[PDB]
């Protein structure tokens, strides 16, 4: 049937995948050792998109772990989730690229790219309904940028027509770690425009704002930030892993949300995202959280949504939701005038309601709420998020700082110049279409 493959490249690929595949074992009733208990067969209704069958219910994830460094991969090969994954699906590196492009685009990647594309083809030949790709990466990583652009340069030659999905983290304009992240974000945007269907972005700080105010988590780290992103990942798959009245597959997401083949970069949002106590004193209706979707304390990228112009807003609901107030509240959004559209698209809405409510992680900070919304809103606030990063790249480039690492690794300096004219017209097209 339909079967979807996931690829995890970089350390952000490692631990986000350590949460998403951890979460899916809860939502299908699969024990982490590798087999299933017999009670979760009725829950296991069309789980075939990720898990091959082996011998007696033993379910390997159709997932590939790619890293140039063996350290964080051994965390998978130490914990409980060691026996779940397949060993020859784990392909490790030895020498690190250290957030450098040609160290991750030519040096260690080209010794390992031929090993992993076989493991792509070894697994994908079982498919008769191969839909899409979950590729997880960063923007400033050596293998996060240098290998990811090269990997998407090769799978479009192989499979082409079949879809792709990229999840990543938007680098914050104020608080971020690596100094080469303004460099590599221009590099990972250069040749991945042509080789990616859609790519999503989240902020470190925009997670933190709801963590401190609504979750009331005043000591967050990369443990709980992986759980919050994984709920957004799981809510997309709920249209596919279960039987809904009006649901949507991966080819349909890009068909609605891509108005032009270059501007295809929306973001995410999730609500209700609060702690376990505040849901007790409040009855969260449909009109409650849907109006909570379109306020700037709910976006997952810290920018100005009111200074952006909405073009195609996508909505996926979960839980037992009636469509009457849905057909009212989205109309009640249209009664408000602050939600600005473009003049040519009034019909940029998507309706999706699944029967299954989201189930929370065990021992987590969330609360069991029936209603939830995964808001996807492509807008022109991405252009205002382009200018904050195009300011960082050029001024460090003008003094030619940190160029002496990019030179000797098999890389040219004129490629920095061509990406400048490439990204200049990109943020222009938000204002040209808008």
């Amino acid at each position: 049937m339909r079967e979807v493959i996931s690829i995890h490249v970089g350390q952000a690929g490692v631990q986000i995948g350590n949460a998403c595949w951890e979460l899916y074992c809860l939502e299908h009733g699969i024990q982490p050792d590798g087999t299933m208990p017999t009670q979760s067969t009725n829950e296991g209704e069309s789980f075939t998109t990720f898990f091959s069958d082996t011998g007696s219910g033993r379910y390997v994830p159709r997932s590939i772990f790619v890293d140039l460094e063996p350290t964080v991969v051994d965390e998978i090969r130490t914990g409980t989730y060691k026996k779940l994954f397949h060993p020859e699906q784990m392909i490790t590196g030895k020498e690190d690229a250290a957030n450098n492009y040609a160290r991750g685009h030519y040096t260690v990647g080209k010794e390992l790219i031929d090993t992993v594309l076989d493991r792509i083809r070894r697994l994908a030949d079982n498919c008769s309904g191969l839909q899409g790709f979950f590729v997880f990466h960063s923007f400033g990583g050596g293998t996060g940028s240098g290998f990811t652009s090269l990997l998407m340069e090769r799978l479009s030659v192989d499979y082409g027509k079949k879809s792709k999905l990229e999840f990543s983290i938007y680098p914050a304009p104020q608080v971020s770690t690596a100094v080469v992240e303004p460099y590599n974000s221009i590099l990972t945007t250069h040749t991945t425009l042509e080789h990616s269907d859609c790519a999503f972005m989240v902020d470190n700080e925009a997670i933190y704002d709801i963590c401190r105010r609504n979750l009331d988590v005043e000591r967050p780290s990369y443990t709980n930030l992986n759980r919050i992103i994984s709920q957004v990942v799981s809510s997309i798959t709920a249209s596919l892993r279960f039987d809904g009245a009006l649901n949507v597959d991966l080819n349909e997401f890009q068909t609605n949300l891509v108005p032009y083949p270059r501007i295809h970069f929306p973001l995410a949002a999730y609500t209700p995202l609060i702690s376990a106590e505040k849901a007790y004193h409040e009855a969260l209706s449909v009109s409650d959280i849907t109006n909570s979707c379109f306020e700037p304390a709910n976006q997952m990228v810290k920018c100005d949504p009111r200074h952006g112009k909405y073009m195609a807003v996508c909505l996926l609901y979960r839980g037992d939701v009636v469509p009457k107030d849905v057909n009212t509240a989205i109309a009640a959004i249209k009664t408000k005038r602050t939600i600005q559209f473009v003049d040519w698209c009034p019909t940029g809405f998507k309706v999706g309601i699944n029967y299954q409510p989201p189930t929370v992680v065990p021992g987590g900070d969330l609360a069991k709420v029936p209603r939830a919304v995964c808001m996807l809103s492509n807008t022109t606030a991405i252009a205002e998020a382009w200018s904050r990063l195009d300011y960082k790249f050029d001024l460090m480039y003008a003094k030619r700082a940190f160029v002496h690492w990019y030179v000797g690794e098999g890389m040219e300096e004129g490629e920095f110049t061509e990406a400048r004219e490439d990204l200049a017209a990109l943020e222009k097209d938000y204002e040209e279409v808008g």
Partner: protein, 426 residues
């Protein structure tokens, strides 16, 4: 004898019939095994029209179930009345349209059209003389509006003689359902005005307004919205399945209404409609059931009936009724509402009365009207269709499939000539 197949394509029309066959099962006294348990043989003497009995009475519905994915197959199969359908007909693909017309028409629908074409042929070879087809699909989505669009273009090569019922949902002015919803409308109706005989433009929006006021139901289940679509369709074919003082087949419903080979775009109506507690407090007279039929409340589409003119009034009444009171009040509406009719067509009322009511009432009324305010249905979508063609958005999902730009404009000219023809006689 007079035999009709029912074909479902796209996610909309696949679940409409899934509640609709149940009433057809229950009006004739059969079981999910197809076991006849009707007490009177009035439920058996016209059982053959939608069924092919084989090998000790397990009646199979003359139904074809097509999808581009196996998602909607198992839900109907494991759901209610799943054992009744013939597993020979479970033909499907592995793509999914992704709300794309040229995928459903040129790319992916062109593969699966050959398999069910023989299935259309196979059940039509085992009968003496076919009568017409009934088709449930969508016009907003991509599967039924792309694949069921092309199916009518090949029925006329097999059977250029009979009638074609193409029941499909239509967009609403208030809230759009999909993003390419004006694209899926103009390109479909381009083929619907070529080779079809009737479409019933049912708005998703106004069905809640029926349920919110009459039924007062706070929780609209999608089984219940199609249930009001289910009782509409069963009242249309009551003459072919039941006797009475005046019988009227689908061709008589066709020939009385459509005046010109394009204007066949009709909206349906049904009375009585109310909640539970208002049963005894109103009257079950001919007069009370009359004025409900001619209200904006009973308009299943969200168009205003006092912004148009009724051309052909079809009154399919169900139940033991007095003919003269039907003859009384159908005169009386034109003595009241002569502005609400077209003027140059005299005697706008067509009346067909079967003496059998549906299960659950004592006297019912199945209305199908022709208001020229349905011109505004194609006014509102022709602007939304030309809202995005002026900026050439989403062209890489159609030209990337291989669609012509003139395929838009040829449909766009024929869309605008359509509202000129309602304007011709209004």
């Amino acid at each position: 004898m007079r035999e009709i197949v029912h074909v479902q394509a796209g996610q909309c029309g696949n679940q409409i019939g899934s509640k609709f066959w149940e009433v057809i099962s229950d009006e004739h006294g059969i079981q999910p095994d197809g076991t006849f348990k009707g007490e009177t043989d009035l439920q058996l003497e016209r059982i053959d029209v939608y069924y092919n009995e084989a090998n000790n009475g397990k009646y199979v519905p003359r139904a074809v179930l097509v999808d581009l994915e196996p998602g909607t197959m198992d839900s109907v199969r494991s759901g209610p009345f799943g054992q009744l359908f013939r597993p020979d007909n479970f033909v499907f693909g592995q793509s999914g349209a992704g709300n794309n017309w040229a995928k459903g028409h040129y790319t992916e629908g062109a593969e699966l059209v050959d398999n069910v074409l023989d299935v259309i042929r196979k059940e039509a070879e085992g009968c003496d003389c076919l009568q017409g087809f009934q088709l449930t699909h969508s016009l907003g989505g991509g599967t039924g509006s792309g694949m069921g669009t092309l199916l009518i273009s090949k029925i006329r090569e097999e059977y250029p003689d009979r009638i074609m019922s193409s029941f499909s949902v239509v967009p609403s002015p208030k809230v759009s359902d999909t993003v390419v919803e004006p694209y899926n409308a103009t390109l479909s109706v381009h083929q619907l005005v070529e080779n079809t005989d009737e479409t019933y433009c049912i708005d998703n929006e106004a069905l809640y307004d029926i349920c919110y006021r009459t039924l007062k139901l706070t929780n609209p289940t999608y089984g219940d919205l199609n249930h009001l679509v289910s009782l509409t369709m069963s009242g249309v074919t009551t003459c072919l399945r039941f006797p009475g003082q005046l019988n009227a087949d689908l061709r008589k419903l066709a020939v009385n209404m459509v005046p010109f080979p394009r204007l066949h775009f009709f909206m349906p109506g049904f009375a009585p409609l109310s909640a539970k507690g208002t049963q005894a407090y109103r009257a079950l007279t001919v007069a009370e059931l009359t004025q409900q039929m001619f209200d904006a409340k009973n308009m299943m589409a969200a168009c205003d009936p006092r912004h148009g003119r009724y051309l052909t009034v079809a009154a399919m009444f169900r139940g033991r009724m007095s003919m003269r009171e039907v003859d009384e009040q159908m005169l009386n509406v034109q003595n009241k509402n002569s502005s609400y009719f077209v003027e140059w067509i005299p005697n706008n009322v067509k009346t067909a009365v079967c003496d059998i009511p549906p299960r659950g009432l004592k006297m019912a009324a199945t209305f199908v009207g022709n208001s020229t305010a349905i011109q505004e249905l194609f006014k509102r979508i022709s602007e939304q269709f030309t809202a995005m063609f002026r900026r050439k958005a989403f062209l890489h999902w159609y030209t990337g499939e291989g669609m012509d730009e003139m395929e838009f404009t040829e449909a766009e000219s024929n869309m605008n000539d359509l509202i000129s023809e309602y304007q011709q006689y209004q």
